[PDB]
Write a protein that binds this DNA or RNA. Structure first.
Lengths: 56, 465
RNA sequence: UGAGGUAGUAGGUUGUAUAGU
């Protein structure tokens, strides 16, 4: 019944796709006060892992 | 009117059988394939060198970050990225007195100053490795500012090179001792002050990148493989030939060709070439006499047999200049009939700057250009979307590959080169301009052609960079 | 790490001091 999250051929893209799940979003556990710069630097500032396509 | 065919970035294999493009980010994610249990660091220098090395390693214990880490990624700490431990304790030190330094320095001749310093360092390493009951796997000597700035050949106030680390490594080849050279300015930019005040080796915003480079070099020299290559067809050997010129005074130095061999593993099973007085530099086109050609080919073949227990079905040969036909005639007389010979020449001096018609970033790395079926232009330099910045300055310049003889698919050699150019070990970078077998070619030629006393060097790679 | 700077050679031009029939 439930959706299968891919983790087979890779783990980083599977981890970010897991992060894309609702109620498990990019916000860390509804952060009350602090300890947010390190995780945003680690993950949301490191969003780029693949390429893109365009004609130039 | 003509297209620029792109080649995908080959992913390097990491821990748990997984792959990622960037070595820094994925290495922070997964880690090394085979962990070591830790190594002992032997620092050779002064008390100032002791305290600055201990302070720097304690600094790199804790996680440190660069200015923006899309380009220069994070350093989470040595234990947090490699697994093997590193602490200021159990570190062996060898005393380098100022009295020997001053007595050597007061001599006017700079060349014999280099001679006596390398003799002192080699003798102290020998007397540290031949009688000490402890064990050191990696050595980290420290050179201060005054020694580096006074040992320059042209600083104005014969069988050895003027520079230090080349002949230190060359004389340390025979005893199979791995070591690393660290400038004082490299790890002590905090107190290294010029006339203005700024650090000369301004590593402030990239102390994470410095820690990345140093830690990767240390883990390479430790014995654990940092990364391997993703896709390799069975039965191919990347024989990147060196033709570093040798200038040992007035004797016939001629050609001192060497090679690095890639068969199934990232490390290069390097076999030394001959001192080799043949092919007078009037004919300095850097060809090969047939007998040394079959010697080198047989060396590579039996290396493949001893490391893979089979015959290589294909041979890659890399060089900078072109190839003749008699050397390939001598080559093919010893090859098995099912083999294939490919000789690819790599050049850089060809001027070709593909300017960007409009935008804010130049041509990326990996966009190749095909001229013929045997020669092509490959862009191993420039922008990459993962790092989100270029690796070059102004406009990058591509490499020009050329299959001299032997039939092959140009896409196959293009992908092989693009896979080869992402294994830089001494510098922890995503990619470089030249391929790794050619980037390390200058280093291995300089080391193997600095001391003539070496006959059969250690063919592992850890004693060179 | 990429663009400038010096020595001089890829491969065919014509000046030295001999010798083929």
């Amino acid at each position: 019944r439930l959706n299968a999250i891919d983790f087979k051929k890779s783990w980083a893209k599977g981890l970010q796709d897991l992060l894309d799940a609702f109620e498990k979003q990019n916000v860390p556990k509804k952060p009350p006060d602090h300890s947010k710069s390190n995780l945003l630097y680690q993950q949301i500032f490191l969003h780029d892992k693949q390429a893109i396509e365009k004609e130039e | 009117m003509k297209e620029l065919i792109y080649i995908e970035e080959p992913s390097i294999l990491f821990a748990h059988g997984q792959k990622c493009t960037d070595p820094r980010d994925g290495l922070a994610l997964f880690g090394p394939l085979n962990q070591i249990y830790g190594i002992k660091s032997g620092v050779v220098g002064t008390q100032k060198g002791l305290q600055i090395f201990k302070s720097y390693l304690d600094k790199i214990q804790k996680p440190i970050y660069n200015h923006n880490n899309i380009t220069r990624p994070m350093f989470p700490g040595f234990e947090a990225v490699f697994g093997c431990k590193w602490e200021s304790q159990n570190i062996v030190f060898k005393e380098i007195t100022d009295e020997e330094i001053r007595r050597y320095l007061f001599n006017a001749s700079t060349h014999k100053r280099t001679y006596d310093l390398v003799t002192l360092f080699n003798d102290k390493i020998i007397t540290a490795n031949k009688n000490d009951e402890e064990r050191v796997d990696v050595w980290f000597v420290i050179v201060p500012e005054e020694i580096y700035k006074y040992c320059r050949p042209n600083s104005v106030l014969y069988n050895y090179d003027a520079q230090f680390h080349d002949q230190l490594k060359a004389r340390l080849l025979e005893h199979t001792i791995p070591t690393q050279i660290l400038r004082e300015s490299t790890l002590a930019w905090r107190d290294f002050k010029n006339t203005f005040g700024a650090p000369i080796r301004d590593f402030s915003k990239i102390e994470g990148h410095l820690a990345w480079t140093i830690s990767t070099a240390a883990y390479y020299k430790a014995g654990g493989k940092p990364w391997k290559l993703g896709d390799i067809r069975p039965g191919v050997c990347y024989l990147g030939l060196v033709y570093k010129k040798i200038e040992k005074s007035k004797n016939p130095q001629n050609a001192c060709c060497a090679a690095q061999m890639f068969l199934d593993n990232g490390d290069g099973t390097v076999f030394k070439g001959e001192v080799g007085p043949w092919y007078n530099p009037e004919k300095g086109e850097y060809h090969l006499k047939p007998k040394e050609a079959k010697a080198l080919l047989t060396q590579a073949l039996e290396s493949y047999k001893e490391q893979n227990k089979s015959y290589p079905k294909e041979v890659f040969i890399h060089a900078r200049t072109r190839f003749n036909d008699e050397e390939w005639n001598a080559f093919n007389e010893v090859t098995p009939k099912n083999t294939n010979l490919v000789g690819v020449t790599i050049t850089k001096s060809k001027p070709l700057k593909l300017y960007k018609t409009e935008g804010a970033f130049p041509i990326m790395r990996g966009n190749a250009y095909i001229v013929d079926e045997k020669k092509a232009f490959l862009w191993t330099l420039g922008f990459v979307p993962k790092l989100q910045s270029t690796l070059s300055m102004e406009v990058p310049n591509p490499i020009f590959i050329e299959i001299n003889k032997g039939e092959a698919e140009i896409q196959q050699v293009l992908k092989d080169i693009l896979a080869l150019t992402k294994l830089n070990y001494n510098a922890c970078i995503y990619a470089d301009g030249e391929p790794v077998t050619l980037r390390f070619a200058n280093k291995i030629g300089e080391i193997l052609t600095a001391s003539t006393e070496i006959k059969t060097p250690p063919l592992a790679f850890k004693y060179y960079i």
